Amino acid sequence: HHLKPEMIEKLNEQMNLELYASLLYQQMSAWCSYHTFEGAAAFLRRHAQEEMTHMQRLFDYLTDTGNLPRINTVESPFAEYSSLDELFQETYKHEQLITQKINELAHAAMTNQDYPTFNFLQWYVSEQHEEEKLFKSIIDKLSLAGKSGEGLYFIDKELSTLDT
Amino acid sequence: LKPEMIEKLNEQMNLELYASLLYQQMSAWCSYHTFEGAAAFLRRHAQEEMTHMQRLFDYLTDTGNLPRINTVESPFAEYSSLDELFQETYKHEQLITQKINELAHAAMTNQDYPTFNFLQWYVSEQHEEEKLFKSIIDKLSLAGKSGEGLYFIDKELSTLDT
Amino acid sequence: LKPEMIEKLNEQMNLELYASLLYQQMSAWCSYHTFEGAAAFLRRHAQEEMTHMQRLFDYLTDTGNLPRINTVESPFAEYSSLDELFQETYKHEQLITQKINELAHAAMTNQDYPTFNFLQWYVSEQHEEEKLFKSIIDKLSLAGKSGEGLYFIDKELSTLDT
Amino acid sequence: LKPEMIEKLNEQMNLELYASLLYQQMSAWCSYHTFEGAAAFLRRHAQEEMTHMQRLFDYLTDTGNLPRINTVESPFAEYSSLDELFQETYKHEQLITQKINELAHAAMTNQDYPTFNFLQWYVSEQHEEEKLFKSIIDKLSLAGKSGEGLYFIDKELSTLDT
Amino acid sequence: LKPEMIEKLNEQMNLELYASLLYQQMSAWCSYHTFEGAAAFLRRHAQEEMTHMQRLFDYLTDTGNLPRINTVESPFAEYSSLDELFQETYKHEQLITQKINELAHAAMTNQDYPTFNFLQWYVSEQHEEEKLFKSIIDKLSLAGKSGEGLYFIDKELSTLDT
Amino acid sequence: HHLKPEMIEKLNEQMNLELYASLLYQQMSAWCSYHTFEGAAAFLRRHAQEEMTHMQRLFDYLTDTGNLPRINTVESPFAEYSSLDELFQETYKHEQLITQKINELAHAAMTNQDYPTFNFLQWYVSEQHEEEKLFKSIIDKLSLAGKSGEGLYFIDKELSTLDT
Amino acid sequence: LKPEMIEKLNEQMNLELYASLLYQQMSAWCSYHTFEGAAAFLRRHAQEEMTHMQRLFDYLTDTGNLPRINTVESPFAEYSSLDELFQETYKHEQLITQKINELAHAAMTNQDYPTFNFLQWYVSEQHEEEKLFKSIIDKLSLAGKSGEGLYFIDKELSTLDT
Ligand SMILES: [O-][O-]
Ligand SMILES: [Fe+2]
Ligand SMILES: [Fe+2]
Ligand SMILES: [Fe+3]
Ligand SMILES: [Fe+3]
Ligand SMILES: [Fe+3]
Ligand SMILES: [Fe+3]
Ligand SMILES: [Fe+3]
Ligand SMILES: [Fe+3]
Ligand SMILES: [Fe+3]
Ligand SMILES: [Fe+3]
Ligand SMILES: [O-]
Ligand SMILES: [O-]
Ligand SMILES: [O-]
Ligand SMILES: [O-]
Ligand SMILES: [O-]
Ligand SMILES: [O-]
């Protein structure tokens, strides 16, 4: 009648991963701002907020099922980036990690015959397809136009209102 | 900004982040213990603390500095009652008040008038924060000694400050 | 559909009908004991259970099968308290959830993707049902130990989920 | 109420429930045999019968009694034709009409004016029911001897009685 | 995506394209034989199948793959009657259903949860497709044995599902 | 009183050519998407839809005149393209083919004294003038600005809303 | 205009007038045989033919010519059936189409581009006319073999093309 402990903890850990993603994109916004990419910064701050809502959805599934979500220690998301391109390469990699972890969670759910949690997960499976499309689109814009300061100026302006 | 001020500002941004996560984490305790109204209030307040963090983050970027989100300590705790939880929220907000005062003092000592000015938003906010969390404890002292009293205070929390 | 699936789908249709008449019968106990608010919630939720019936009925007729309404045993029971009555509704919902999960497992085993898909509505509905009925138990545990407590909870149930 | 009138009212409640389940089970036959308009009318009618149960259920609870949903025998049956099914529905309505007149007679001869008054809703409903179900068997006798005629009557049934 | 899944997805996109062209081609038979209502319905449905093709096309591009529209076999056929035409539409839709099931099975076996998820739209759609084309055959069995019956069914088709 | 068999078949064949054009532009949209030209892709998908309506108009003239349109075998439109420019060179060539075939059909109509079909064709004669203008405009934008990744970025954005 | 063109344009003006009075006369047969719907369609279409007259009349006067209304022979005919009557309207339309095509050929031969252009309205109108009148024949072939069939077709004709 209740979630297995395995499933509870994997859901908890994914909630933390969503929280880390939020703090990551927030931290990356600082780099952007520091390096004068205000458009890239605004996009990343809005995307950080979005990741909180992914975190909250997991938190809510956990409480709705009679469990206690646990926010664990959070590693500093601080990193050096050599370019805006390398920053957004890292974003895409991170989103690929999140997709992997959701697929693992879905695999655990099916293997455990946890149909409620499999069903809950579908939101994330779908979301992660949209996330990879979004961030791959940014890398693609940069690989096309990003090799000059003018190109970066334009893409940075695009990012300032992207996905709004 | 002088190094001292950069460091204290960056620390405060991290304290505001921690406040957000703490209130989020307390909302899970509340839901877990059937106080869904207290949970709603703390979830809302967690969102609020993120905006406080954000305001510091943006001051630091505005001034040519690089804010740095440091390792966050887990906010996980046990509480013996909804009262004790809200005693802890109040103590936390008194800590944030104190650090804001220290920051204001440092700004004034360093003749940093742009930061002293920036800080006034927090001084004012922290006055409102303490009044709000005090109000909650006060409600609990009054009515909170029974299941019914907690029931009503919980319901009051569900829409408090909205 | 495979015979196993037809039979388990028809059985679940009948269980949702049973749940309807159960909650309908429960509303009588409530009325009889003066809990007109609990009565009203239970009468509304009896209607909702018939829609869960119809959705299975429809899937069965859509797929070329003839659903059968089988004999329904009397849902009549004694309850010792409002709290015990809602402990029984919660257990009943848990049983429905489990039946649904068995059906989903069966669909998977039988490689019945149409039926696995159809069942997802029930998986999601049952998560909401368990939450609803647990919230009721949780209100009664908290505040339900006095007549005054029960008066308020009954009042809340009069508009709950509307 | 007098024990006799309690029992007769409770049995009528159960007869209304049975009518519901019967018209529901008939709608399945109709779907299986491709009369989806006839199926839709019977599904809607099944829902109306449930409201007729709710009205008796509610009079019993209002008068400080405890209505009991008794065991309901499966309403499953074979039908040789759509016309036969609708002959059966008309027959079942005549039964219901008869049990209502018997209830009205029992109320008047027991000097039970409250219950007499309450029953008038059913006296007038059962007049409307008979004219509705008579109308369908009349349409079928006129036009229902060809596939084309059943086609059109089925279509009329899809939206009949809104 | 794994090679197997790319290939099966690409094949299904091509099956959906073929469905569109088949329904278009059947609409020409219908117009040619004076059933302009059946023609309108099949022209509309051809448009629908293109959106199904399109949804697969976009999943393939989204996932970094290159969808490939292969040689399309002529859909030209003779039909002996409007009934036989609509028997063939139904058989085609059962074929699309089956291939969607195979794709769902493959996705699940390969632990490809993004494709399994993507596929649910089709599982659900194919349930609706079979109900719709079944309804059409069913109408024809009932009423379609005469010029008048075909006349009316044709008119019904002109605005069916709009 | 009826169309000549010559005219019926030439009209049938043009309907198929319009269908092929649709599948062509749809197939070309895949190349664009694959090569990150999402704007070019959206334009080509919208243009594919347009070609279906050209197909349908022929189909309808055929049925209105008591004939049976026939969809024939359709060759795969799959091709390799070395650049976005070369892709849109191919589009223009294709549209030039369609214009040729319509002019041949008009010439057959006049030669056969088929005034109904000549009149019907005028829609296409006019449409093909507008099609060549449209696709020549795209080649011209590319020859002007298309020689850098930045130029391609801008034209690709133009294509994303062109002719809407 | 060349004398050949003036004469063929005037003749066509007279043919469109004839068509008017023909369809008007046909509406009488229909009325007389109780097909008031067919009557009404034919009366509306008689009006439309006069507008085809006026358009040629106007082109003739615009170009400096004097159109002449010549003797119109009685359009009176016997018809054996509604179907035969509409077979005759269709043949009549075919004749008009052919006359128009002859006129267009003449304009081309005479290098009369103004007149070739003017005639295009008629080429396009005549494609629509043949479609309209063929659709009527087609309805009657399908469903017109019974009184009941004819009743429905007559009803459709009462609002056809309005
Ligand atoms: O029975 O109404
Ligand atoms: Fe339930
Ligand atoms: Fe005419
Ligand atoms: Fe996320
Ligand atoms: Fe994300
Ligand atoms: Fe249920
Ligand atoms: Fe009734
Ligand atoms: Fe009834
Ligand atoms: Fe075209
Ligand atoms: Fe074109
Ligand atoms: Fe005319
Ligand atoms: O996520
Ligand atoms: O704070
Ligand atoms: O703060
Ligand atoms: O359910
Ligand atoms: O009744
Ligand atoms: O399909």
Ligand SMILES: [O-]
């Ligand atoms: O499909």
Ligand SMILES: [O-]
């Ligand atoms: O075209």
Ligand SMILES: [O-]
């Ligand atoms: O004409």
